[PDB]
């Protein structure tokens, strides 16, 4: 199969490396699941140890943590927007780690109304306390909410876990990727 | 495959034909009544183990803890074997050994020395024909070499005609025939 070993390929000197052994199962690799958007499917691959490792193939949804507010919501995905490594993966909408993705933002907007009551577009006391405790929201995130979208980095490896998780972009990361979206335009 | 060590007891000399060597070896056959030149070269080799051991030790130093251990163990053997006399226990004395000292200690001579055998040749025949109790049990082999406490002990075997048993077979043929 796919040999991960160093017995093939050159030495540092530029010399062929002698090989007197057949391929070994512990020097294994497997074909890469370029997982994407769509309705959910996932395949348990039996690995070394007996231990199972769940290969993503299509993922609709994911758990995405807002960092500053300290909450996380289950959310549907819309599209893959940017990738650092390969522009072909954005072309096909392929979910990988470090991949920048669009997100519904109606879970966060419903929470932000309920928690604070400043909104976007007996308790009251609890809301005020929460506001004092924690709601200004960046100027760019204010514009971003108006579309009904957010931007977020995929943090999990979908191929290993069988799960798209991530975190929402904010501050310097958000200002950075807004350059290289606008530059291609 | 099998875990059994083995070694060679002797080795032949470099020069085959020397009249100095062949004469002096032939005396040792004639004195002590030996079968062949291998029996000399056995003892020639056996000395050179002990001699090369002392040669290694003697170069060092008298207060060195290797020499005081390994020397005293080697000197115990020479006192026990009756090879060096007990009046001198110096390691230096081991070097002054000869092949005649070893060949006087073997059981061919110590029968004859005892005097029961009468003649060197006869003594070898008495050993091989199942006589001569050394200590508790009888011994069949000329090249035995006696440990000095044991030497007084050699006597005819309890069994046998010299000993006091059935008179072999040929005396019975004469006695029952008559």
């Amino acid at each position: 199969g796919i040999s991960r070993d160093r017995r093939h390929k050159h030495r540092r000197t530029g010399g062929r490396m002698p090989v007197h052994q057949k391929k070994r199962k512990f020097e294994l690799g497997r074909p890469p699941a370029m997982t994407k958007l769509g309705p959910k499917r996932v395949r348990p691959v039996r690995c070394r140890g007996g231990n199972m490792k769940y290969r993503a193939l299509r993922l609709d949804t994911g758990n995405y943590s807002w960092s500053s507010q300290k909450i996380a919501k289950k959310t549907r995905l819309l599209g893959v927007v940017y990738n650092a490594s390969n522009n072909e993966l954005v072309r096909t909408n392929t979910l990988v780690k470090n991949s920048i993705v669009a997100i519904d933002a109606t879970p966060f907007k419903a929470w932000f109304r309920s928690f604070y009551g400043l909104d976007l577009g007996h308790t009251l006391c609890l809301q005020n306390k929460h506001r004092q405790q924690g709601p200004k929201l960046d100027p760019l995130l204010e514009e971003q909410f108006n579309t009904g979208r957010l931007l977020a980095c995929i943090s999990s490896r979908p191929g290993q876990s069988g799960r798209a998780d991530g975190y929402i972009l904010e501050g310097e990361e958000l200002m950075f990727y807004k350059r290289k979206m606008d530059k291609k335009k | 495959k099998s875990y059994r060590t083995y070694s060679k007891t002797a080795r032949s000399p470099k020069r085959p034909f020397e009249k100095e060597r062949l004469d002096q070896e032939m005396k040792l056959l004639g004195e002590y009544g030996l079968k062949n030149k291998r029996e000399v070269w056995r003892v020639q080799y056996a000395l050179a183990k002990i001699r090369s051991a002392a040669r290694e030790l003697l170069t060092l130093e008298e207060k060195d803890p290797r020499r005081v251990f390994q020397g005293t163990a080697l000197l115990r053997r020479m006192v026990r074997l009756g090879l060096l006399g007990e009046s001198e226990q110096k390691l230096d004395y081991v070097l002054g050994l000869t092949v005649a000292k070893f060949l006087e200690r073997r059981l061919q001579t110590k029968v004859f020395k005892l005097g029961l055998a009468k003649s060197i040749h006869h003594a070898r025949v008495l050993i091989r024909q199942r006589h001569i109790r050394v200590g508790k049990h009888i011994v069949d082999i000329p090249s035995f070499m006696v440990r000095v406490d044991s030497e007084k002990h050699v006597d005819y075997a309890i069994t046998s005609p010299f000993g006091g048993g059935r008179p072999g077979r040929v005396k019975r043929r004469s006695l029952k025939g008559g």
């Binding site: - | 875990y3 803890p65 163990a73």
Partner: protein
């Protein structure tokens, strides 16, 4: 290759068992509390030390009676690794054997009293926090005592009760505490601890001093604290881990054999 080796060979066995060269091609192979080369299997106690069994067959006939125990627990497997500072208890005869290291570097079953054979010592490998934020020792034996004192650190011994699970008496690892060696060149030697060097990176070593004022060193993995500065929790074997010299061991041995 391809998996774990089920046979071990004679000769490729440990030397400190003292299995002979002939009379077998293979040797018994001990996994249990202890390592392969820092243990001795229960067959070679019974046949080649204590001389109860003759054969490998007869050890099965002994052990499947359920007469042998270790640590107040019946072990049915004949090739069980019974290592340093384990108690063995046979109910018939009513005699107990704590395995210590002999001064030469061998295992020997030291016979002991009935009240002494309750307890045993375990030097702790490290200390570590388990789930629900509970603390827990782990031993050289591969036990894991839990809820200790905060007092108890790494590299020091604890008297276990065995009749019950719990600890009783701690000991500390410091200068002026009695300490046996369990491995390496100086195995079977007991002496007070003078000093330890740190060497911040790998392998701490300890110099320590025999009761006849002989000084010698080992790594900390080998060193095993018995007791306080002079005295000891346990009973010791013949010679008490002095290790007298080569010419002395000659002189005492041949003086014996003349009777």
């Amino acid at each position: 290759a391809r998996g774990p080796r089920k046979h071990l060979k004679r000769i490729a066995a440990p030397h400190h068992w003292m299995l002979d060269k002939l009379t077998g091609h293979y040797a018994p192979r001990p996994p249990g509390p202890h390592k392969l080369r820092e243990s001795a299997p229960l067959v070679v106690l019974l046949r080649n030390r204590l001389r109860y069994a003759l054969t490998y067959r007869e050890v099965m006939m002994i052990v499947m009676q359920r007469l042998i125990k270790v640590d107040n627990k019946v072990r049915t497997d004949q090739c069980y690794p019974a290592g340093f500072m384990d108690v063995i208890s046979i109910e018939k005869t009513k005699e107990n054997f704590r395995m210590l290291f002999d001064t030469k570097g061998r295992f020997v079953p030291h016979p002991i009293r009935e009240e002494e054979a309750s307890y045993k010592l375990c030097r702790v490998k490290k200390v570590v926090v388990g789930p629900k934020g509970v603390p827990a020792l782990i031993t050289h034996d591969g036990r894991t005592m839990r809820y200790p004192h905060p007092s108890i650190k790494a590299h020091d011994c604890i008297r276990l009760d065995l009749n019950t699970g719990k600890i009783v008496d701690t000991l500390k690892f410091e200068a002026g505490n009695m300490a046996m060696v369990t491995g390496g060149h100086n195995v079977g030697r007991v002496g007070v601890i003078v000093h330890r060097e740190r060497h911040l990176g790998g392998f701490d070593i300890i110099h320590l001093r025999d009761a006849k004022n002989n000084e010698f060193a080992t790594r900390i993995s080998n060193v095993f604290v018995i007791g306080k500065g002079e005295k000891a929790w346990i009973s010791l074997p013949k010679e008490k881990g002095i290790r007298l010299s080569i010419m002395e061991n000659r002189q005492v041995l041949l003086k014996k054999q003349q009777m």
